[PDB]
Amino acid sequence: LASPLEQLRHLAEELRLLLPRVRVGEATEEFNREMFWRRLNEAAVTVSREATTLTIVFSQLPLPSPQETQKFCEQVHAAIKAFIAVYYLLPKDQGITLRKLVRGATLDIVDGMAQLMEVLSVNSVWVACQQMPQIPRDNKAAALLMLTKNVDFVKDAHEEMEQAVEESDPQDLYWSEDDQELIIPCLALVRASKACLKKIRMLVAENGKKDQVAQLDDIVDISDEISPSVDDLALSIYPPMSHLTVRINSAKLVSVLKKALEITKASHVTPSWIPLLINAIDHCMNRIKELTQSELEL
Numbered sequence: 001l002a003s004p005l006e007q008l009r010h011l012a013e014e015l016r017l018l019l020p021r022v023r024v025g026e027a028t029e030e031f032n033r034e035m036f037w038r039r040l041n042e043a044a045v046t047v048s049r050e051a052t053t054l055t056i057v058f059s060q061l062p063l064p065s066p067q068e069t070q071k072f073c074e075q076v077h078a079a080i081k082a083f084i085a086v087y088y089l090l091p092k093d094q095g096i097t098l099r100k101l102v103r104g105a106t107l108d109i110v111d112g113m114a115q116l117m118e119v120l121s122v123n124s125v126w127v128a129c130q131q132m133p134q135i136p137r138d139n140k141a142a143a144l145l146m147l148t149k150n151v152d153f154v155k156d157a158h159e160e161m162e163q164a165v166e167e168s169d170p171q172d173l174y175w176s177e178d179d180q181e182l183i184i185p186c187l188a189l190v191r192a193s194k195a196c197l198k199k200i201r202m203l204v205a206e207n208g209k210k211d212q213v214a215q216l217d218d219i220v221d222i223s224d225e226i227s228p229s230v231d232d233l234a235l236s237i238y239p240p241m242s243h244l245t246v247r248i249n250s251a252k253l254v255s256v257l258k259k260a261l262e263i264t265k266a267s268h269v270t271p272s273w274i275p276l277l278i279n280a281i282d283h284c285m286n287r288i289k290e291l292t293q294s295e296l297e298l
Contacts, residue, residue: 037137043082084106153231182243185288190234200261200264203269229256
């Protein structure tokens with residue numbers, strides 16, 4: 001048996017080896033919605049007990065004997081194994097979005113517990129274990145969550161670019177008057193994007209129905225694209241900003257928003273406001289095409 005601090009080092013290592021495995025995982029007509037969430041919670045509590053136990057113990061001297069450490073390490077692994085096992089009990093059946101969140105929480109826990117084991121060898125885990133009650137328990141709430149995560153991301157991008165522009169002086173690495181002028185539409189387009197996600201969230205909130213696992217997953221899937229579009233768009237705005245690239249990215253975003261809106265209109269979630277959001281969006285893009293025509297002329 002190795003050193004106690006050495007033994008933990010290996011526990012940590014052995015722990016991270018799971019992350020890849022948990023990312024991709026095997027998984028039912030008889031599925032206990034409530035019995036599931038009960039077991040997972042317990043799983044979590046147990047995990048954090050072990051974290052606490054190890055923490056208090058390896059905080060003081062002398063350290064435990066090598067065999068004592070061996071037991072501790074096992075308890076930790078057992079607690080982790082048991083938790084993952086519960087995760088693996090959740091059927092894709094219940095929602096891809098739902099499963100992603102449980103999966104991510106599961107990984108967070110595993111990774112946290114690994115971080116701590118390293119640290120002890122020389123509060124991610126506890127926080128991670130705290131999360132259990134918070135995480136959604138049906139694909140509707142999961143979708144809602146995912147949607148607000150998007151709204152927020154877009155909102156920040158907006159703010160960043162806006163501050164960015166403001167601070168711009170009242171050669172390269174600069175913004176031209178032309179650059180400045182073309183930024184205006186791009187920014188509204190981003191704002192319209194947020195407007196879109198918020199509209200979608202709202203409709204899902206008001207009309208979404210837990211049963212519609214597939215459609216919820218659908219609306220979420222396309223919704224998620226809005227953010228990287230925006231991200232790509234923003235990144236090309238900053239200098240040196242190629243107008244050609246801005247035009248392309250803008251068009252990508254538009255196509256996305258529209259695809260998002262279209263999928264929402266067909267879902268069980270539909271009502272209107274969508275047509276005039278599309279008016280705003282078209283006007284932005286039209287304005288962007290116009291500010292940028294000389295690039296695509298010959």
